[PDB]
Design a protein around this ligand. Structure first.
Ligand SMILES: C[C@@H](c1cccc2c(-c3ccc(CS(C)(=O)=O)c(F)c3)c(C(=O)O)[nH]c12)n1cc(CNC(=N)N)nn1
Ligand SMILES: [Zn+2]
Ligand SMILES: [Zn+2]
Length: 232
């Protein structure tokens, strides 16, 4: 009823949307992994009379439910999707999107890692993002490669019309006490990559983590803090 959705407010197998700003929503779904249940976020950005999707809803059935929830709540077609790294909370559901007519995109690094890991593979490669600090425009957003952090391929997304920074899994929520699933992370480089985000997007008003509650710019420093303590 208005608060940011958590696992306890999303019915089984469903997705909920949250209005972040004019023409910007997050999507929230839940999934089980190694015997525990986790929430995860993505983004939806209005692109005229179409929608740009950032990240799947973590699984085929969740992503089908996402498309149905978008049709119910927004009613504009999703035409393109970008996955911000290679893990299943970002690409799991790409096959569903592709069969629903959505053009799916990721960096070549993400596509290679997804392929090698056996995860679903976005169709189209996003060039121009291979060096840290690189940025490219993609419809109503800017895509930014901050350097290795949660994964070597992680991208962040900025919505300039609303000053919304979607950090993906390189950014953690304020309540977090550890650095999440770090199996593919670079804990030594992560603070430097966060510093790059801070320097590039100093006017961000909303910061959205890959998992958990949005907040403000404090999420970036908090993330650096929890990562440094995980490493040390
Ligand atoms: C599919 C994905 C995955 C599954 C389950 C949990 C998470 C979390 C996470 C875990 C805990 C918290 C709470 S908290 C910050 O308070 O600890 C959180 F907010 C997020 C993250 C993330 O952190 O983005 N991602 C996860 N995955 C798969 C792999 C590869 N694994 C490997 N052995 N090679 N890595 N991630
Ligand atoms: Zn991940
Ligand atoms: Zn994640």
């Amino acid at each position: 009823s208005g608060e940011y959705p958590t696992v306890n407010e999303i019915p089984v197998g469903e997705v909920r949307l949250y209005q972040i700003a004019d023409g910007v929503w997050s999507h929230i779904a839940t999934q089980s992994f190694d015997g525990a249940v986790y929430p995860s976020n993505g983004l939806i950005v209005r692109d005229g009379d179409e929608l740009l999707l950032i990240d799947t809803a973590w699984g085929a059935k969740n992503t089908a439910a996402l498309l149905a929830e978008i049709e119910k709540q927004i009613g504009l077609p999703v035409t393109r999707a970008v996955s911000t790294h290679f893990h299943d909370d970002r690409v799991g559901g790409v096959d569903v999107l592709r069969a629903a007519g959505v053009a799916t995109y990721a960096s070549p690094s993400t596509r290679r890692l997804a392929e090698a890991e056996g995860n679903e593979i976005p169709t189209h490669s996003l060039e121009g993002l291979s060096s840290s600090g690189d940025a490219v425009r993609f419809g109503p957003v800017e895509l930014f490669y901050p350097g290795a952090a949660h994964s070597t391929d992680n991208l962040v997304v900025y919505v300039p019309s609303a000053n919304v920074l979607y950090g993906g899994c390189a950014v953690h929520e304020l309540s977090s006490t550890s650095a999440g699933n770090v199996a593919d992370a670079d804990l030594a480089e992560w603070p430097t990559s966060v510093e790059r985000i801070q320097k590039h997007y100093p006017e961000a008003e909303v910061v959205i983590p890959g998992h958990g509650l949005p907040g403000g710019l404090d999420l970036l420093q908090h993330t650096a803090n929890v990562v440094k303590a995980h490493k040390n």
